[PDB]
């Protein structure tokens, strides 16, 4: 493995102060670093660490061409939608994972940070779209959605609606409606330059 010693900047991904709204989900090209995943996988911090196309035990031996770390805040009952072959308004219109995905979908309950007594509404999701997303498609587009045959002409009306709904996280909403921060660590395996590496000597 390469003559490199700098630890992965997972600190800038997980313990970041501000997370993206899922409709505008953030991405970081994690690269050129030694990524220890055991400190993540073994933590009690996370409420799920399920992985696809790889085993969380094994992957500390692996090396990859890059990690894309994607992150967003979603509802508790929407965490299930962040998985291959799933359906729902998040998977269809906000964040689509490919069938052949390989990676880990990490989530933890973040109600202590992402809710306020008067409700937090800064976290926002696309409720309406014409057609489902392609895998890792991302449209920040604010353009008003038209549901009917009647043209909307940029004014909200009886069959055309502003496409984004605020989640509304009050501290009281319960475990299913509380906010969860999600990180989707995605891998690609093929290429000759191994660029993010395990802690093997």
């Amino acid at each position: 493995f390469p003559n490199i010693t700098n630890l992965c900047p997972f600190g800038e991904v997980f313990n970041a102060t501000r997370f993206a709204s899922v409709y505008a989900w953030n991405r970081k090209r994690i690269s050129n670093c030694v990524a220890d995943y055991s400190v993540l996988y073994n933590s009690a911090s996370f409420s799920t660490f399920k992985c696809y196309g790889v085993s969380p035990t094994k992957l500390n031996d692996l090396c990859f061409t890059n990690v894309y770390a994607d992150s967003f805040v979603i509802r508790g009952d929407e965490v299930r939608q962040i998985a291959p072959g799933q359906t729902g308004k998040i998977a269809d219109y906000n964040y689509k994972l490919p069938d052949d995905f390989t990676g880990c979908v990490i989530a933890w309950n973040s109600n202590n940070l992402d809710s306020k007594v008067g409700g937090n509404y800064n976290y926002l999701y696309r409720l309406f779209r014409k057609s489902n997303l392609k895998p890792f498609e991302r449209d920040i587009s604010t353009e008003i959605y038209q549901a009917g045959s009647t043209p909307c002409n940029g004014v909200e009306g009886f069959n055309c609606y502003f496409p984004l709904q605020s989640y509304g996280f009050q501290p009281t909403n319960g475990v299913g409606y509380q906010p969860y921060r999600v990180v989707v660590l995605s891998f690609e395996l093929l290429h000759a330059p191994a660029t993010v590496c395990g802690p093997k000597k």
Partner: antibody
Amino acid sequence: QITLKESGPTLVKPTQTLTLTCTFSGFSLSTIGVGVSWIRQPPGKALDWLALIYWDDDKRYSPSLKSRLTVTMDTSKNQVVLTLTNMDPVDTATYFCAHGLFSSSDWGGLDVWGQGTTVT
Amino acid sequence: DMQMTQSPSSLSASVGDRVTITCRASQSVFTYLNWYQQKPGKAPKLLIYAASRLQSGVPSRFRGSGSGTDFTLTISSLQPEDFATYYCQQSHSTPFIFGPGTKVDIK
């Protein structure tokens, strides 16, 4: 210094902005959970909650004044200013700015208040 | 919408008496309700953070109770300096409307 605050002018004319200010000490209003809320009281009448600004610049207004009321801040001066845009004499009142705590651990207790100012 | 009312719009009382003040909140407010007292021309003082949660700097004769839609405040035995007007506040639905106030009368 322990948490303390004050408020601005008292002279009013009707078709004018009230252009109040509030200024404070002992809290940053940038620490997570800190908020400051505006409460008015007509003389000998109920309290009337006007508005609240949180940390991270989230703003809330009383719905019947939302079209007619704005609040804004300066993280550097430790000031908040409220500008009700046009006094109708029902708006004559004492105005207060009160501190509170508003994060997930907190309860929105308006725990310390300024002495407030009359508006004529 | 949200609305907030208090049952004894004024209550006659005397020193040493038990007294109780009652708040009805239209929607479920959970425990996010506050109690304030005001002496005329002074700013209100917060007494209760949340139902049953007493402030520091407030004597043990003040306590409150309830949850959801109906809430209560109780003073076990009035000192004469406790005579004031009392306001509830809800701290959950985004306009934190106060109640109409309840004044205790020496009468």
